[PDB]
Ligand binder design. Structure first.
Ligand SMILES: Cc1cc2nc3c(=O)[nH]c(=O)nc-3n(C[C@H](O)[C@H](O)[C@H](O)COP(=O)(O)O)c2cc1C
Ligand SMILES: Cc1cc2nc3c(=O)[nH]c(=O)nc-3n(C[C@H](O)[C@H](O)[C@H](O)COP(=O)(O)O)c2cc1C
Lengths: 201, 196
């Protein structure tokens, strides 16, 4: 059971888009976030912050301001009205989701370099670390019976997130995580072989 | 299940036991279960099996480091101490390089949304890396993520004959831990979890 339990974890993780209306224990969120932070991070750094959007008027106003920017940006692009609203409808999950947690990059412990190349490299390294912390959260949720779906939208509206949530300039949003009990039971995924995604040299 | 992610430690000393290849393969299949934006495949894992190529790529990385850190004005002392921290990639039984590839990237005319898309693909690869280190661990195999290839991307592309838009996102040293470790027991998030 201990062997198996070890083997099962990451295969319970699906991108869940339809949530039942069962409230989420606060404690599972908190514990799952604690597990998430076992992900690796460069030494003497803390790249990841998780920003849990508990106040519904705050969640809501951030999402409306995002929606608004989306329509005007997609309109500049010359997309037709219907197509814009199709896209915008993709964001409805963040409105209805039982919980929402924004992962953010912060350059805590970042090394400082004089040149642009190594400064970008450093920010990249920090970016993949937050990426690792997000996977570890989705899996921590999934093993506590909780579904989730990573929505990348805040990445395209960093200034609006920062302004709305009153965060300093160097906090960088890396999406949004919708969290809830899935409306439909889902089994274990049976992953496929790596095939062309693994390259031998 | 409570176990899996807690077996994952950054391990820096491996035994001489060889690593069965089918575990590296199966573990990469599991890593790619990580989420990815729709109709994209941001991640490639590049396994350095050919020892001459590994030795040759690290050697050029070592040279680039020495030459750079000397530009910065570090003392020979401190330089040798820092570069010796890359010995692990020489010694590790296996080395896998995760790489970002813009496969299925949506196209934008402006730099702002272009960068956002690149950032989106970058975090997806990170998630896949975590998924790998866990997948390995749950098959009783240690690993360590080393960031260095991110700082020598041109060298890595040159040396591995990869195209210009393959971006290395470190290197994962893999082997059986020389000393076993206890499970992790994570501390609560405290100030890293912000409530709004
Ligand atoms: C992006 C990234 C780069 C890293 N680069 C290095 C490295 O160059 N050398 C090294 O020894 N460890 C490296 N690590 C491993 C971290 O040092 C390690 O995660 C940290 O010391 C905490 O250990 P833990 O993973 O055992 O929780 C890296 C981790 C990440 C996420
Ligand atoms: C960086 C990132 C951004 C994402 N953004 C979205 C999104 O805006 N909408 C969405 O439905 N799913 C999003 N996803 C989830 C993927 O669509 C999902 O992983 C894919 O449908 C199938 O994988 P899964 O069901 O195995 O997770 C995102 C994933 C990542 C890594």
């Amino acid at each position: 059971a201990l062997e198996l339990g070890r083997q099962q974890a990451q295969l319970l993780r699906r991108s869940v888009r339809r949530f039942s209306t069962d409230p989420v224990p606060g404690d599972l969120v908190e514990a799952a976030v604690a597990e998430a932070l076992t992900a690796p991070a460069p030494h003497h750094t803390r790249p990841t912050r998780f920003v849990w959007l508990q106040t519904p008027a705050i969640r809501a106003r951030l999402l409306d301001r995002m929606k608004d920017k989306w329509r005007s940006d997609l309109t500049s692009d010359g997309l037709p009205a219907d197509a814009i609203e199709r896209r915008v409808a993709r964001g409805q999950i963040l409105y209805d989701a039982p919980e929402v947690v924004i992962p953010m990059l912060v350059p805590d412990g970042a090394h400082s370099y004089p040149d642009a190349a190594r400064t970008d490299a450093e920010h990249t390294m920090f970016t993949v670390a937050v990426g690792a912390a997000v996977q570890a959260l989705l899996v921590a949720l999934a093993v506590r019976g909780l579904g989730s779906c990573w929505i990348g939208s805040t990445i395209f509206a960093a200034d609006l997130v920062r302004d709305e949530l009153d965060l300093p300039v160097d906090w960088e949003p890396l999406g949004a995580i919708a969290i809830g009990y899935a409306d439909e039971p889902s089994g274990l995924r049976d992953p496929v072989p790596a095939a062309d995604l693994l390259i031998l040299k």
